[PDB]
Amino acid sequence: QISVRGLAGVENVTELKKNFNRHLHFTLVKDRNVATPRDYYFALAHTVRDHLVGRWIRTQQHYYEKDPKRIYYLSLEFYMGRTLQNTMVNLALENACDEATYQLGLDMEELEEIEEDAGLGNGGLGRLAACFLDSMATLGLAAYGYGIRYEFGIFNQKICGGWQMEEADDWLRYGNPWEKARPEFTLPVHFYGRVEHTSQGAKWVDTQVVLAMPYDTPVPGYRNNVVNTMRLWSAKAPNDFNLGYIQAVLDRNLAENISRVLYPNDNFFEGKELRLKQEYFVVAATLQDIIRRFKSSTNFDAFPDKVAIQLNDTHPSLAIPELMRVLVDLERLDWDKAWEVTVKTCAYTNHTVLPEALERWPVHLLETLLPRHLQIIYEINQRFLNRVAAAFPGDVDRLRRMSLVEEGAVKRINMAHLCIAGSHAVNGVARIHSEILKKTIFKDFYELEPHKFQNKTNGITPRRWLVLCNPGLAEIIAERIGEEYISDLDQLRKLLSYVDDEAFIRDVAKVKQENKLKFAAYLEREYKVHINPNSLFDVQVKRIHEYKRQLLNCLHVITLYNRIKKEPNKFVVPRTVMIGGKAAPGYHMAKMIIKLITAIGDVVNHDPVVGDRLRVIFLENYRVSLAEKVIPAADLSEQISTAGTEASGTGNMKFMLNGALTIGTMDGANVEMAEEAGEENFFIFGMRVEDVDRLDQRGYNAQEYYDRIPELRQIIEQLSSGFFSPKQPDLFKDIVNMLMHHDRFKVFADYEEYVKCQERVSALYKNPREWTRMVIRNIATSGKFSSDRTIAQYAREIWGVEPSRQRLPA
């Protein structure tokens, strides 16, 4: 049908059709008479999977012969989404499979909707790992993703009476065609026990053993015949576990609970023992695998030349003392040599400056669970602080600030300080974020070791986030500039010479309109909600957090409603305001924010005077597969975090690539986006980082804004009096109290500039040609934000490997 989706050759279509029928018969044990749509999906999945196998085997044998340096990306999260369409795209099979299924009397898009998301992540950090895997394969790096095979990923969100309800994400119920269990590579992981000192070293004894069974998932590069591996560990009880008899067998669940469920708290660190077990489990199993592969190529001096370990946040930070444990206790290397190897092997990526989100594990937990690791950490700390003392003699406070051990009521280990000490590289995820690390929370560490600190601005994969989700846009771009931009996104700059091209302007606008119609139809069919597709699609999708200021969005929505009610017969640009995202189950304020949004919708959507001029919809169960739908349909991307709080953001980049304009603060990657596109082509508003700092020095008084802005006063009085909750008048008292008395994120301070800037958005939307021309300027300058650029920077500046666009033989 469309060019970028590949060839549909006679030979290929015929071959796909028969392999489909073979799988339906032999693999699924069904005939066309009893087969359900789910059976058809699985027959297709197995057929496409067959095309990966040869490439997967030969990629791994290639790495064995060539023995390049291996990259190990360690993460507790891999937010993968669906695999079927992505695999077809990267293998150039999409058109052939579409034709093959069409001839079999099936609709491939319908079949694609049956696949469960692999929701093994919370949000940005987990999705970054997934985009990174795709880019590493595309750039021909010998890379492995290592994590946990959670039985239950991020919860499915249901909205009941306006409130978030959580249900188990049983994503493996029907099976996973993509994974291959490798029970032959099962490794033991140790917990508890005690440390015994002998004549020749320390010994970790009397431990409880949990088995780690790996499951491998293929990660195909974009049309380069490279297929890398994501290896996820599952927890298994050893067979003599607890071995009245019946209970012993049932107690095996205790051990296997380690890989049962993803922790959904992305707002606040919680020192829970099960989470610590998960962190060590992935780390211990992974490092044994790394060392085995290194030996199957004695001299650990060459270890850093053949191994890079990237730590996705501090979550796998136990890799540092675990590597030390193996090298010192098992391999018998001296401390200093082991430490040299460890530092040169490890690098750490930070994702937030918000203190409540940082991991600080109580010492008593580590003492009980991992007694030898605590000893190693204490030894690391002493030696590190000796260096600090020698570099800054007499600076006693620096010594207590930089310590990995935090004193207080409960002694804690600062995992971030451990990571800096034990890594040759520390990076933030956007230029402004990396600078904030150097100036604020890691200032002392930067002054000690400036060479260690880097920036690696985040990116997204243009395969999933353009070609897959927005083929219409991909195709019109390909018509003008060809196809090479898909793995070389900087080529989008060539689109700047089409900004005054009447045909391109018309095509860009046409693609957006079709995407909006398709999404408007998704809303009716699956949720029975009705929207005007001619309205401006105003969308804020991301996890619910105070710092992301969904609440500021809410205040604007209410302002629009109030202005309409004041002057009903005045023309306003019609808007569909869409807000979506999950709240962490223990985050009360975030759950109140969801309820507020639905409560506003209940009032606004049923007011006869409003009509189709304003609609407020909460997007239920926001996840990777829903993002692929809503982002291509968006006109306005809301990126409105308080300056200095969003490390980077990546949703922002997804919207920019797909033809939405951005209203945002100068925060995270928004700064670089505005820099690339031009400030005239971005809707920038609000306090900069410096303005926030000035307000903090003075003291933020919200009352001042309430007193001086009549329109804001009205909203607060509506919230307090029960206007949006007539049956429970004080339902939103917590929200009002927080806004008035303890708002860390200065919602009121940006309110005026935000509303003003929003008027400038509506004004532009009224001029369709000029709106579209600004869009083209955004799409054409989104190239920097490809995760191919990000990964090439990690590769060259941290890992010491050269990327390669060269094909492997088919």
Instruction: Using alpha carbons, list the distances in angstroms from residue 615 to 403, 519, 555, 600, 626.
Output: 52, 15, 14, 10, 19
Strands 346-349 and 425-428, sheet pairing: parallel
Binding footprint of its own copies, residue count (CB under 8 A) = 51
Of the candidates 665, 638, 667, 678, the one whose C-alpha atom is nearest the C-alpha of residue 778 is 678
- Is 288 exposed, middle or buried, given 0-12, 13-18 or 19+ CB atoms closer than 10 A? middle
Strands 201-205 and 194-198, sheet pairing: antiparallel
613 belongs to an annotated ligand binding site? no
Of the residues 18, 25, 760, 805, which one makes contact with its own copies according to CB under 8 A: 25
Binds 50: which of ligand F68, its own copies, none (CB < 5-8 Å by kind)? its own copies
Task: Please report how close the Cβ of residue 520 comes to its own copies at its closest, in angstroms.
Answer: 29
Of the residues 85, 86, 122, 598, which one makes contact with ligand F68 according to CB under 6 A: 122
352 part of the interface to ligand F68, by CB under 6 A = yes
Task: Please report how close the Cβ of residue 619 comes to its own copies at its closest, in angstroms.
Answer: 21
181 part of the interface to its own copies, by CB under 8 A = yes
Binds 486: which of ligand F68, its own copies, none (CB < 5-8 Å by kind)? none
| Residue 451 among the catalytic residues | no
Of the candidates 726, 734, 754, the one whose C-alpha atom is nearest the C-alpha of residue 599 is 726
Beta strands in 558-624 (DSSP E): 575-580, 614-619
Of the candidates 225, 272, 233, 286, the one whose C-alpha atom is nearest the C-alpha of residue 61 is 225
18 part of the interface to its own copies, by CB under 8 A = no
Task: State the Cα–Cα distance between residues 772 and 765, nearest whole angstrom.
Answer: 9
Residues in 550-589 at the binding interface with its own copies, rule: CB under 8 A:
585-586
| Residue 582 among the catalytic residues | no
When the beta carbons of 564 and 791 are compared against ligand F68, the nearer one is 791
- Token pair, residue 618, equals 């909460």
Of the candidates 81, 546, 129, the one whose C-alpha atom is nearest the C-alpha of residue 313 is 129
| Residue 662 among the catalytic residues | no
793 part of the interface to ligand F68, by CB under 6 A = no
461 part of the interface to ligand F68, by CB under 6 A = no
Residues linked to residue 413 through DSSP beta bridges, in sequence order: 361, 405
246 part of the interface to its own copies, by CB under 8 A = yes
Task: Please report how close the Cβ of residue 123 comes to ligand F68 at its closest, in angstroms.
Answer: 4
| Residue 456 among the catalytic residues | no
Instruction: Using alpha carbons, list the distances in angstroms from residue 732 to 161, 545, 704, 779.
Output: 15, 17, 21, 40
How would you list the strands of the sheet with 360-362, edge to edge?
360-362, 412-414, 405-406
Task: Please report how close the Cβ of residue 158 comes to its own copies at its closest, in angstroms.
Answer: 9
CA 352 to chain centre: 13
Active-site entry in 231, 373, 654, 777 = 654
Task: Please report how close the Cβ of residue 499 comes to its own copies at its closest, in angstroms.
Answer: 49
Of the candidates 290, 427, 428, 418, the one whose C-alpha atom is nearest the C-alpha of residue 359 is 418
Q: Which residue has the tokens 């969100």?
A: 157
Residues linked to residue 619 through DSSP beta bridges, in sequence order: 580
267 and 587 Cβ atoms separated by less than 8 Å = yes
253 part of the interface to its own copies, by CB under 8 A = yes
- Is 201 exposed, middle or buried, given 0-12, 13-18 or 19+ CB atoms closer than 10 A? exposed
When the beta carbons of 236 and 615 are compared against its own copies, the nearer one is 236
- Is 150 exposed, middle or buried, given 0-12, 13-18 or 19+ CB atoms closer than 10 A? buried
Binds 668: which of its own copies, ligand F68, none (CB < 5-8 Å by kind)? ligand F68
When the beta carbons of 260 and 789 are compared against its own copies, the nearer one is 260
484 and 10 Cβ atoms separated by less than 8 Å = no
Contact pattern for ligand F68 over residues 630 through 669, marking x by CB under 6 A:
----------------xxxxx-----------------x-
Active-site entry in 51, 360, 542, 595 = 542
Of the residues 215, 269, 335, 723, which one makes contact with ligand F68 according to CB under 6 A: 269
Q: Which residue has the tokens 């297929």?
A: 227
DSSP classification of residue 456: -
Q: Which residues contact 262 (CB under 8 A, 6 or more apart)?
A: 77, 119, 120, 121, 122, 150, 152, 153, 154
Helix (H, G, I), strand (E, B) or coil at 122: coil
Binds 122: which of its own copies, ligand F68, none (CB < 5-8 Å by kind)? ligand F68
Task: State the Cα–Cα distance between residues 598 and 159, nearest whole angstrom.
Answer: 9
612 and 637 Cβ atoms separated by less than 8 Å = no
535 belongs to an annotated ligand binding site? no
When the beta carbons of 150 and 178 are compared against ligand F68, the nearer one is 150
When the beta carbons of 342 and 352 are compared against ligand F68, the nearer one is 352
Task: Please report how close the Cβ of residue 627 comes to ligand F68 at its closest, in angstroms.
Answer: 14
Active-site entry in 231, 372, 412, 543 = 543
648 belongs to an annotated ligand binding site? no
DSSP classification of residue 584: P
263 part of the interface to its own copies, by CB under 8 A = yes
Active-site entry in 23, 417, 548, 623 = 548
| Residue 494 among the catalytic residues | no
When the beta carbons of 354 and 577 are compared against ligand F68, the nearer one is 354
Q: Which residue has the tokens 């279509």?
A: 13
Of the residues 44, 426, 429, 495, which one makes contact with ligand F68 according to CB under 6 A: 429
Binds 646: which of its own copies, ligand F68, none (CB < 5-8 Å by kind)? ligand F68
Contact pattern for its own copies over residues 106 through 145, marking x by CB under 8 A:
----------------------------------------
Name the one range near its own copies by CB under 8 A: 165-173, 394-402, 475-483, 779-787: 165-173
Binds 12: which of ligand F68, its own copies, none (CB < 5-8 Å by kind)? none
730 part of the interface to its own copies, by CB under 8 A = no
Which secondary structure element, helix H or strand E, spans residue 195, and what is its range? strand 194-198
CA angle 353–354–356, rounded 5-degree value: 135
Catalytic residue numbers read 351, 542-543, 548, 650, 654
Annotated binding residues for AMP, as ranges?
Answer: 31, 64, 292-297
Binding residues for its own copies (CB under 8 A): 25-26, 29-31, 36, 38, 50, 53-54, 56-57, 61, 152, 155-156, 165-168, 170, 173-175, 180-181, 183-184, 236-237, 239-241, 243-246, 248-250, 252-253, 257, 260-261, 263-264, 272, 274, 585-586
Binding residues for ligand F68 (CB under 6 A): 122-125, 128, 265-266, 269, 351-352, 357, 429, 458, 646-650, 668
